[PDB]
Design an enzyme around this catalytic site. Structure first.
Site, short mmCIF file in Angstrom:
data_model
loop_
_atom_site.label_atom_id
_atom_site.label_comp_id
_atom_site.label_asym_id
_atom_site.label_seq_id
_atom_site.Cartn_x
_atom_site.Cartn_y
_atom_site.Cartn_z
N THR A 37 -21.51 30.66 23.38
CA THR A 37 -21.07 29.29 23.07
C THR A 37 -22.27 28.41 22.68
O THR A 37 -23.25 28.30 23.42
CB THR A 37 -20.33 28.68 24.28
N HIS A 191 -11.86 37.47 27.20
CA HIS A 191 -12.63 36.78 28.20
C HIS A 191 -11.84 36.66 29.50
O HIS A 191 -11.04 35.74 29.66
CB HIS A 191 -13.04 35.39 27.71
N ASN A 194 -16.21 34.77 34.27
CA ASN A 194 -17.04 33.55 34.32
C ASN A 194 -16.19 32.31 34.65
O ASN A 194 -16.49 31.19 34.23
CB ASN A 194 -17.82 33.36 33.02
N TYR A 196 -13.07 31.33 33.80
CA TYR A 196 -12.09 30.69 32.86
C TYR A 196 -10.68 31.14 33.26
O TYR A 196 -10.51 31.69 34.33
CB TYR A 196 -12.52 30.90 31.40
N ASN A 251 -18.22 28.19 37.66
CA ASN A 251 -16.89 27.56 37.59
C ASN A 251 -16.10 27.83 38.89
O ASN A 251 -14.87 27.95 38.87
CB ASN A 251 -16.13 28.00 36.33
C1 LIG Z 1 -25.53 28.84 26.08
C2 LIG Z 1 -24.73 30.00 26.62
C3 LIG Z 1 -23.43 30.18 26.21
C4 LIG Z 1 -22.66 31.25 26.69
N1 LIG Z 1 -21.38 31.37 26.23
C5 LIG Z 1 -20.68 32.37 26.69
C6 LIG Z 1 -19.36 32.53 26.24
O1 LIG Z 1 -18.85 31.77 25.44
N2 LIG Z 1 -18.64 33.58 26.73
C7 LIG Z 1 -19.16 34.44 27.61
O2 LIG Z 1 -18.43 35.35 27.99
N3 LIG Z 1 -20.41 34.34 28.06
C8 LIG Z 1 -21.15 33.35 27.63
N4 LIG Z 1 -22.45 33.20 28.07
C9 LIG Z 1 -23.02 34.18 29.00
C10 LIG Z 1 -23.80 35.26 28.28
O3 LIG Z 1 -22.95 36.04 27.47
C11 LIG Z 1 -24.57 36.16 29.24
O4 LIG Z 1 -23.66 36.79 30.12
C12 LIG Z 1 -25.59 35.39 30.07
O5 LIG Z 1 -26.37 34.56 29.22
C13 LIG Z 1 -26.50 36.31 30.86
O6 LIG Z 1 -27.23 37.14 29.93
P1 LIG Z 1 -28.75 36.78 29.63
O7 LIG Z 1 -29.39 36.65 30.97
O8 LIG Z 1 -29.27 37.92 28.82
O9 LIG Z 1 -28.75 35.49 28.88
C14 LIG Z 1 -23.23 32.15 27.60
C15 LIG Z 1 -24.55 31.95 28.01
C16 LIG Z 1 -25.30 30.90 27.54
C17 LIG Z 1 -26.71 30.71 28.00
#
Ligand SMILES: Cc1cc2nc3c(=O)[nH]c(=O)nc-3n(C[C@H](O)[C@H](O)[C@H](O)COP(=O)(O)O)c2cc1C
EC number: 1.6.99.1
Length: 396
Positions: A37, A191, A194, A196, A251
């Site tokens: 996102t 999804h 997290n 939702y 959440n």
């Molecule tokens: C800005 C941002 C937006 C995210 N948006 C989503 C999302 O829309 N859907 C989702 O399932 N996870 C979303 N995530 C979670 C990531 O997919 C991922 O699980 C999380 O960043 C942990 O991985 P990382 O440590 O490599 O960043 C988002 C994370 C960030 C930082």
């Protein structure tokens, strides 16, 4: 700049760079772009950016054979409640999505649409403006005090959705999945993670129902499985994945504090594996790791070490994408990809490194990310992040 405290490790010798088939697509590497996102979609109409979005995804598809899961995308207005997050129900939105997939396809990569439904994480006031309900599993328990207040003061108190409204949500998932395929997407990710809507049904803190959609493991799962089942029937199992966060607390989900939580997630994978042996296996399961229970906290923080996602490998026998703090830990990825059905999502560092995959192959330095431009209506922090070639020319 580049990350200062990072000792890189070349990963080109590992399975991270061995090809694998996921659904219909032949991936040439196992570094996956998880759904991210970014809040550049346009209000009104939840429209994918017509100035920046094609470029955002193109850039990040630059390595051939990359699986890209798109940002969360709403199936319907009622699914929504964020002004700057995208949807896939209208012609306007589809026209922009068609172009984004085309650009990914041209860079020899793949695009899976994450179908996102907010429930109680939506803005109750934003939804009231548009005369929509503020939905969840139950009505007697709230995400937090702030959201409860916002909902009362907009005269939009949290609604516990009926069986007919659940069916309606399912129709909107199906239609949204069909729209994604027709526009040229390779598949979709549901999804269910997290915190939702779907996760709010799975988790016993948010779900206080005594009907067929709550009050037992089987019942808490019925909704997630109803959606998976109907989407598969509409577009085929090989174009359908599912994201879960077994130890997430984002959440207000329970996480590991809840003693029945492994069992809840073990049941869902169990049921996916039961469909698979009967001849309809999902393209993948995608797990958020206890390494990251809240992605807005810095790496290292919000880490649950009381539990592991290993149980999933005893139950589900197909491809498993794992995500959470793997960019800064090539030593950990080296051990996880020794399992031959394990792919790795890299979230935050793929925001800041359009050529992240090259950098993982050869052990190059990584571009530092700017948290303040994660969610912002700007080209900056979005499409102006440099490749390693370009970053040397600027002197990092
Ligand atoms: C800005 C941002 C937006 C995210 N948006 C989503 C999302 O829309 N859907 C989702 O399932 N996870 C979303 N995530 C979670 C990531 O997919 C991922 O699980 C999380 O960043 C942990 O991985 P990382 O440590 O490599 O960043 C988002 C994370 C960030 C930082």
């Amino acid at each position: 700049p580049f990350v200062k405290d990072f000792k890189p490790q070349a990963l080109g010798d590992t399975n991270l760079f061995k090809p694998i088939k996921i659904g219909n697509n032949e991936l040439l590497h196992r570094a996956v772009i998880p759904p991210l996102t970014r809040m550049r979609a346009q209000h009104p109409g939840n429209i994918p950016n017509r100035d920046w979005a094609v470029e955002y995804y193109a850039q990040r598809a630059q390595r051939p054979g990359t699986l890209i899961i798109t940002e969360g995308t709403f199936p319907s207005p009622q699914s929504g409640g964020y002004d700057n997050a995208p949807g896939i129900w209208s012609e306007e939105q589809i026209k922009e999505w068609t172009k984004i997939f085309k650009a990914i396809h041209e860079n020899k990569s793949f695009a899976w649409v994450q179908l996102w439904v907010l429930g109680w994480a939506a803005f109750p006031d934003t939804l009231a403006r548009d005369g929509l309900r503020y939905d969840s599993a139950s009505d007697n328990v709230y995400m937090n005090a702030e959201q409860e207040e916002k909902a009362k003061k907009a005269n939009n108190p949290q609604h516990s959705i009926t069986k007919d409204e659940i069916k309606q949500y399912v129709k909107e998932y199906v239609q949204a999945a069909k729209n994604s395929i027709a526009a040229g997407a390779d598949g979709v990710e549901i999804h269910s993670a997290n915190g939702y809507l779907l996760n709010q049904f799975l988790d016993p803190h948010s779900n206080n129902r005594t009907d067929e959609y709550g009050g037992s493991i089987e019942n808490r799962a019925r909704f997630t499985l109803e959606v998976v089942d109907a989407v598969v029937d509409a577009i085929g199992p090989e174009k359908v994945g599912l994201r879960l966060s077994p130890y997430g607390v984002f959440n207000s989900m329970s996480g590991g504090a809840e003693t029945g939580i492994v069992a809840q997630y073990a049941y869902v994978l169990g049921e996916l594996e039961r469909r698979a042996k009967a001849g309809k296996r999902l393209a993948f399961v995608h797990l958020v790791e206890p390494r990251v229970t809240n992605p807005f906290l810095t790496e290292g923080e919000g880490e649950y070490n009381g539990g592991s996602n290993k149980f999933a490998y005893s139950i589900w026998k197909g491809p498993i994408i794992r995500a959470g703090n793997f960019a800064l830990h090539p030593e950990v990825v080296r051990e996880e990809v020794k399992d031959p059905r394990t792919l790795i999502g890299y979230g935050r560092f793929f925001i800041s490194n359009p050529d992240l995959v090259d950098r993982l192959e050869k052990g190059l330095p990584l571009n530092k990310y700017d948290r303040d431009t994660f969610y912002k209506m700007s080209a900056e922090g979005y499409i102006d992040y440099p490749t390693y070639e370009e970053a040397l020319k600027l002197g990092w």
